[PDB]
Amino acid sequence: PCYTATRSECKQKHKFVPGVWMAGEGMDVTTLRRSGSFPVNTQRFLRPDRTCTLCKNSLMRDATQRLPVAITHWRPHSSHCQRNVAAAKVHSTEGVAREAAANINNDWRVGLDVNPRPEANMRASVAGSHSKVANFAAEKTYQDQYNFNSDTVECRMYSFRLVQKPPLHLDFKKALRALPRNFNSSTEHAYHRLISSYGTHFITAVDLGGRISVLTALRTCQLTLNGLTADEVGDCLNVEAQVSIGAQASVSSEYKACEEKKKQHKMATSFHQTYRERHVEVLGGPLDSTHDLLFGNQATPEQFSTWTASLPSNPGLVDYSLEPLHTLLEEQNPKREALRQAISHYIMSRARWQNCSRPCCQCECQDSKVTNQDCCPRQRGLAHLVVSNFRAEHLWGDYTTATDAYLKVFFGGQEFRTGVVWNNNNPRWTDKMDFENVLLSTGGPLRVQVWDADYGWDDDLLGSCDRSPHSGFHEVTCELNHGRVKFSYHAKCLPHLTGGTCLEYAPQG
């Protein structure tokens, strides 16, 4: 929307249109990072006719500015203001409780009386009682709270393009002079010398404007694990035997003996991980809005208004379009071909492992204690417990006959039973017992209980064993009151976890 000026119009101090020098800049296509290279020279401002293109400045007083020849169409977009405010909140909870109790009581008593007629008497009495109490309890609370939001403001003001015949810069010409004839393995290094110094693509169409971006994340993860165990045993025995004779002669023997035993086991475990990230980017502004805009979650509209009012003087970067470098060479020139091949390969190289920030090169999933949004481990302490190779040695279960024994597995509030072989004093079983995902840390103590099936309302207990689960291919041996029981298990940690009880996170992130 402007024209060519004349000799007198092209005399006084006339600054260039804002942000024009950003045009034609090289940019890596791999990283989308501005290396700061200018394959094209935009310094010239006079056509061979010696006139210059003064162009009026909308949204900037009522003056005119200089248009360089390489520029196609400087459109002063009147006004375009966009805002995008996105938010997201996620909550997750999980709560489990197991409780178990067992009460057992038994009593015994006998009484005998003999009264022979010819001057004789006799009495006897016996008593006894047993009691066992067991209590298991466990609580498991998981809660995760994730939060995200992003506020972006854009204001497009300027935009313009280039042609396919712009004046190439002298330094780029000198680089081309030292550049070899065509492509080869030895000369490819020389191409690298060009690439990092001039990028792979150059800006052909550009749009100028101001921008704010504010990203904020907040990831919190809380684990609480509680476990209680309480055992009581009480055994009271009472014997009282008295014998008297018709002639004065008395004997009395009274026994009393009662044992009490208590066991308590409490274990609390708490994990808390909070990660907060903010990130703010600003491209427009003459170092003036920086006074208040960068800091503080809220910006008052007044300094924002001052920023926008001063914005036309200094533009930023909002959008760009890329043109391959080989487009800029001569139409009849072989060294176009041998050029881009290398770049193409080069691109793919940095696409594979040299630069892998965007594809995830599958990365880790944890915040790594710095940057790296990723994820806290949604499950911790879980293991795939597998119990196998049940065997026992030298039992004494059945008194008259051979031992009829069977085992019970108690873990994490779960009650599990096996098959019973008959009449064996050292049997073993081929059961492949699996627990799927269980918490070893707060599953309580693994109990293996050896019972003797005597077909009665009061079964005979050969014994029991308590062990603390740990990760690895472990073997467990237990000596009973009579006989012994041996077996093994392998409760491997779930991935991203290791250690004895599978709580600590092995890698950095």
Ligand SMILES: *[C@@H]1O[C@H](CO)[C@@H](O)[C@H](O)[C@H]1NC(C)=O
């Ligand atoms: C690569 O080929 C060019 C000519 O095509 C030659 O000048 C250069 O020496 C070669 N480099 C090698 C074979 O390493």
Ligand SMILES: [Ca+2]
């Ligand atoms: Ca028995």
Ligand SMILES: [Ca+2]
């Ligand atoms: Ca039995």
Ligand SMILES: [Ca+2]
């Ligand atoms: Ca038997």
